[PDB]
């Protein structure tokens, strides 16, 4: 069927904007990077339903805006980018984006009903070329996190509620990507061909929907789609950066009955080599930068689009030692800090972003 990015205009939200104007411009002195960032909250990065006060609040809100653009007569019409992301027991094998909801406390039921309500929205908005990106992360630790007791105590859960939602949200207007980690995590050639049974079995078992579309990668993360040479972090992995994964990941997908096409994240990927001191640190990585612009012009057959789905400036997790969600990755030596809860703005992470821009503002 159709690329979901062909056609149409990305929104961008009014949520991401509000924070840079509001949090961030304030704080800036230099007027340089005062506009930078105002050009910054343009650019059209996913909106997360990352709780589920989201759902009858922003998520309607986002709809509605478009909604009236597109009534008025919008050329191209805009298109909506929302991930949802609130599993109970979420984020299994760490501890930074610990969710609102617990297996052991109703979470299932819970996630059934958000589920169910997000439904409901997107039928009332059918209207609203819709791209959904389903949790991120989740599948990805079934793959290498079995060892993990969180993780291997919501396998059977995550597996379920991954059906249910492809179901659930399996409607006209409607284009879903499931997440697929990335190169330095399921892109590891022993992890690949595990990874493509998994997501194959998945898409059999919810009865292969129309609108599944495919898989993300890179999300919350920093590769390069695609460089001259591998960073010095990332060996011995001959899948280097996200083309190679993608490359190497297709023939084998497709050769169980998912012919996936792919969106790759690339809201953090402007500057390479990162920070990173290994592959594996993923929380508030310094040295990097606002990478390509999310675009449908891809030059490549099996990636619909680049895309922006972490929006850079939004934190990956707490460096206080004393919280809850503390997890040590985000108290590494290539961990900005300090740093809030994740989800929460950081705006010198944010600034970081902005001067490691490429293409630059
Ligand atoms: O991306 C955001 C997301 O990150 C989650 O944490 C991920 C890391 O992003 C990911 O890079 C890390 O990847 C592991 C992978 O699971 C291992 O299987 C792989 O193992 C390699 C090993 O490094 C080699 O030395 C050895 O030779 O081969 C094996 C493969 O056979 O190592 C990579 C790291 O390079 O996985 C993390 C999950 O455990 C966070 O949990 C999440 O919160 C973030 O949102
Ligand atoms: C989730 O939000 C919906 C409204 O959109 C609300 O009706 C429901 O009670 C909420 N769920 C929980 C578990 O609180
Ligand atoms: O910034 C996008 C998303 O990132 C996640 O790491 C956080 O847990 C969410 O709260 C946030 O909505």
Same mark, same amino acid.
């Given at each position: +069927? ?10 961008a939200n009014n949520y991401y904007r509000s924070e840079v104007h509001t949090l961030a411009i304030p704080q800036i002195?230099? !007027?340089?990077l005062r506009?930078a960032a105002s050009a910054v909250a343009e650019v059209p990065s996913f909106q997360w339903?990352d709780?589920? &006060? ?21 050329? !191209? ?6 991930? &949802?992301? *609130?599993?109970? =027991?979420? *984020? ?8 609102? @909801? ?7 039921? +819970?996630? #059934? ?29 079934? &793959?290498?996190?079995?060892? &993990? !007791? #969180? ?15 492809? #179901? ?52 919350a993360?920093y590769?390069? @789609? ?9 060996? !011995? ?5 996200? #083309? ?21 994240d690339?809201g953090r990927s402007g ?10 640190? @993923?929380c508030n990585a310094i040295?990097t930068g606002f990478g ?16 922006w789905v972490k929006p850079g400036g939004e934190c990956d997790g ?15 030596? =290539?961990?900005l800090?300090?740093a809030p809860e994740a989800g929460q703005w950081f705006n010198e992470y944010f600034i970081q972003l902005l001067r490691n821009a490429?293409?630059?503002f």
């Amino acid at each position: +069927n159709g690329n979901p990015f062909e056609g149409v205009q990305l929104w961008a939200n009014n949520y991401y904007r509000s924070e840079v104007h509001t949090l961030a411009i304030p704080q800036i002195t230099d !007027p340089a990077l005062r506009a930078a960032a105002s050009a910054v909250a343009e650019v059209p990065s996913f909106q997360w339903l990352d709780r589920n &006060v989201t759902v009858d609040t922003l998520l309607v809100q986002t709809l509605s805006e478009i909604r009236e653009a597109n009534q008025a007569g919008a050329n !191209p019409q805009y298109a909506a980018q929302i991930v &949802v992301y *609130d599993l109970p =027991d979420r *984020d299994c094998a760490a501890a930074a984006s610990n969710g609102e @909801w617990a297996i052991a406390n109703n979470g299932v039921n +819970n996630y #059934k009903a958000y589920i169910n309500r997000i439904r409901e929205i997107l039928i009332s908005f059918s209207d609203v070329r819709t791209i959904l990106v389903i949790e991120p992360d989740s599948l990805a630790n079934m &793959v290498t996190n079995m060892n &993990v !007791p #969180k993780c291997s105590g919501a396998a059977s859960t995550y597996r379920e509620l991954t059906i249910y939602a492809l #179901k659930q949200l399996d409607l006209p207007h409607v284009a879903m990507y499931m997440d697929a980690g990335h190169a330095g995590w399921l892109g590891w050639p022993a992890n690949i061909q595990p990874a493509a049974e998994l997501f194959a079995k998945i898409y059999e078992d919810a009865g292969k929907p129309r609108a599944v579309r495919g898989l993300a990668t890179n999300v919350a993360n920093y590769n390069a @789609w695609s460089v001259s040479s591998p960073p010095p972090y990332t060996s !011995p992995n001959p899948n280097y950066d996200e #083309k190679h994964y993608i490359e190497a990941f297709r023939p084998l997908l497709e050769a169980r009955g998912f012919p996936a096409q792919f969106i790759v994240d690339q809201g953090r990927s402007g500057k390479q080599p990162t920070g990173q001191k290994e592959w594996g640190h @993923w929380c508030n990585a310094i040295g990097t930068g606002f990478g390509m612009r999310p675009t449908a012009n891809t030059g490549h057959q099996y990636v619909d689009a680049f895309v922006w789905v972490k929006p850079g400036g939004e934190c990956d997790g707490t460096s206080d030692t004393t919280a809850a969600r503390y997890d040590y990755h985000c108290g590494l030596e =290539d961990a900005l800090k300090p740093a809030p809860e994740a989800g929460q703005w950081f705006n010198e992470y944010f600034i970081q972003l902005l001067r490691n821009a490429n293409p630059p503002f």
